[PDB]
Structure 1
Amino acid sequence: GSHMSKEPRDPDQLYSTLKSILQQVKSHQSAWPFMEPVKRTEAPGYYEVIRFPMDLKTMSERLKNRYYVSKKLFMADLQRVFTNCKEYNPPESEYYKCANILEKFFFSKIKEAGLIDK
């Protein structure tokens, strides 16, 4: 269509733009701990270290209704899942690598769609 790769302004465009990212983040090998919502016990203290609980189980649920149509909105949620994940799980299990891996692909994806916030 056009020759642009950094302007997720329109909601209709950013709509599927995030759908593709979330769609991949869900199919990504590193995306189990986010698929299922982590209770407030199975995790090494969660209600305490986590002030803004967030999981892929609720993200796609909101995306389907076009809830993320801005920039830091979707970028914040995704980061919330990875950043908060490591926060509760000490850098020792394999979950740490999963977030870092899916977090790397995510950053690259928004770079291709034009998301990114900083």
Structure 2
Amino acid sequence: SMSVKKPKRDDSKDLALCSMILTEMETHEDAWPFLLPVNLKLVPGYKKVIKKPMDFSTIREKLSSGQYPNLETFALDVRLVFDNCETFNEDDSDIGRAGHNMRKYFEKKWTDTFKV
């Protein structure tokens, strides 16, 4: 509270580390369904069903332009990518499988990088 400061982690490396994690995401062979925005004019239903579309290139732009206040808001957008994927795609499909794989891949890198 007021004048009662909690010790908090050094956050000076977070921007660089998040960029590093995102690069690893982008270069994963199963990243292809998530590299670019889903084309709202070619994919029926997507615009109406998915209220907050997100993809790696949008995340990269926001990261590079100071639009994440902290690492937690960055993680929310990454997870949003895979939550959207589950909403629109069957688990037993190429894209569906891709999503589960990429989520698992992210969460380990997240733990290994920041949960010291």
Q: Is the 8 A contact 1:35 1:56 kept in 2?
A: yes
Give the structure 2 partner of residue 72 of structure 1. 72
The alpha-carbon deviation at position 97 of structure 1 amounts to 0.9
Which blocks of at least 5 consecutive residues in structure 1 are unaligned? 1-6
Would the alpha carbon gap of residues 26 and 83 (structure 1) be closer, same or farther in structure 2, given more than 3 Å must change?
A: same
* Cα-to-partner distance string for 1:20-47 (whole Å, 9 max, x where unaligned): 1111110011111111211124435211
Give RMSD over aligned pairs. 1.9
How far does the alpha carbon of each residue in 1:72-102 deviate from its partner, in whole angstroms, 9 at most, with x for none? 2011100111110121122232001111111
Regions of 4+ moved over 2 Å? 41-44, 65-69
Cα distance in structure 2, aligned partners of 1:8 and 1:17:
14
Residue equivalent to 2:13: 13
Structure with greater helix share of residues? 2
The yes-or-no answer on 1:59 pairing with 2:62 is no
1:112, CA displacement in angstroms?
1.2
TM-fit CA distance, 1:114: 1.0
Corresponding residue for residue 3 of structure 2: none
**Structure with more relative contact order (C-alpha pairs < 8 Å, separation 6 or more):** 1
| Bigger-Rg structure (1/2) | 2
The match for 2:88 is 88
Q: Identify unmatched segments of 5+ residues in structure 2.
A: 1-7
Matched residue pairs, number?
Answer: 108
Spell out the pairing of 1:104-115 with structure 2 (5 A cutoff).
Answer: 104-114=104-114
* Identity level (%): 31
SS at match of 1:54: coil
- Residues in 2 aligned to 1:64 and 1:74: alpha-carbon distance in whole angstroms: 12
Distance of 1:8 and 1:86 partners within structure 2: 33
Q: TM-score normalised to the size of structure 1? A: 0.80
